Amino acid sequence: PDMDTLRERLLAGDRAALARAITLAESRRADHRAAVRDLIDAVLPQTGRAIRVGITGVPGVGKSTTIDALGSLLTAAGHKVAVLAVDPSSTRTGGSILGDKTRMARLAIDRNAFIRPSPSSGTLGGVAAKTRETMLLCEAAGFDVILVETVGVGQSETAVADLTDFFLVLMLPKKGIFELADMIAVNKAGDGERRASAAASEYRAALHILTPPSATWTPPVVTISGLHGKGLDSLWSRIEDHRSKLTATGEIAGKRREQDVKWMWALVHERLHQRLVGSAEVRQATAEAERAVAGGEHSPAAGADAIATLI
């Protein structure tokens, strides 16, 4: 596939060129990844002009429909919205070709939206680092809103926070999640407005004893109904407010640089993993070592030196 032509169509907003480049970046084949490595670098100065928001929520109510509604609001307002899934179980599959795009009915047909399932990789750090490469591609292609969502039942919340500028947690009327939140939004806001309002008050009180990482921002709690689009404009205004404030201080850029280095190393460690499971003997010996350490038969360091010797 001609890479310069691919780059120009991607830079001109061609959705199929973008998908093609992402597919190359998602690929589990080394020659594919390598090809689109130059393209991403080349296009790097056109990346970053976007709000990156990570979104997670309690098993139950309303994340997909809330994202569909938030998504639909931002497109109708002139934005281009990518929605990327991170799911740790894609370390145990080979990915998804089609994904699951109609869990968000309006965005699934919204020509100004782009939806992509969790990429496959050997490690969760690898899944996430590929997501970062995908985010960069979407941004080069002119997407100014990147929503990254946790999709497993597994533990992807920290990785998604470390992929984004702002972490939104959606709750009903897991301690780790609370202190990742730059905002909490209580879902299903009149008979239940009462309940949401109260719960919001409770969560606001809980948050108080957690010192925010920066003096520039103090996480608020808000109420919404994703079902009926209520509260979303205000919710979004805060995220925008946060963008202006932490951009002025340089803190968004500072967070992004930290994340980028974390992802680089996750990819180095992914490549190490891939070597260790890349043939039968090494793979068997690696599992043997790990198993001995877990079972308390050999010490962490004995396990480690056995693994080091296979490399």
Ligand X SMILES: Nc1nc2c(ncn2[C@@H]2O[C@H](COP(=O)(O)OP(=O)(O)O)[C@@H](O)[C@H]2O)c(=O)[nH]1
Q: In a 3-state reduction of DSSP, which class is residue 160?
A: helix
Residue 233 engages ligand X in binding (rule: CB under 6 A): no
For a second copy, the closer of residues 41 and 240 by Cβ is: 41
**Token output for 308:** 């080091």
- Is there binding between residue 267 and a second copy (CB under 8 A)? yes
CA distance 277 to 241: 46
Phi/psi at 47 (5° precision) = -100, 175
Contacting a second copy (CB under 8 A), which of 248, 272, 277, 287? 272
| Binding-residue pattern over the window 83 to 102 for ligand X, x denoting contact by CB under 6 A | --------------------
Nearest to 283 by CA among 161, 122, 147: 122
- Give the per-residue contact string, 3-42, with ligand X (x = CB under 6 A; - = no): ----------------------------------------
303 is annotated as contributing to ligand binding = no
Question: Cβ closer to ligand X: 68 or 133?
Answer: 68
How many CB atoms neighbour CB 4 within 10 A? 9
Cβ within 8 Å of residue 109, ≥6 positions away: none
303 lies in the site for a second copy, by CB under 8 A: yes
Q: Looking at beta carbons only, is 78 or 295 nearer to a second copy?
A: 295
Query: By rule CB under 8 A, what count of residues binds a second copy?
Result: 60
- Closest alpha carbon to 240 in 217, 211, 262, 224: 217
113-116 contacts at long range (C-beta below 8 A, 24 or more positions apart):
113/71, 113/75, 113/80, 113/81, 113/82, 113/83, 114/15, 114/18, 114/80, 114/81, 114/82, 114/83, 114/138, 114/143, 115/82, 115/83, 116/22, 116/82, 116/83, 116/84, 116/85
64 binds ligand X (CB under 6 A): yes
If one asks whether residue 307 binds a second copy (CB under 8 A), the answer comes out as: yes
Residue among 2, 98, 175, 250 that touches a second copy (CB under 8 A): 175
Give the binding site for a second copy (CB under 8 A): 25, 33-34, 37-38, 40-41, 44, 48, 129, 132-133, 136, 174-176, 178-179, 202-203, 205-213, 256-258, 260-261, 263-265, 267-272, 289-290, 293-305, 307-308
Give the binding site for ligand X (CB under 6 A): 57, 59-65, 187-188, 192, 225-227
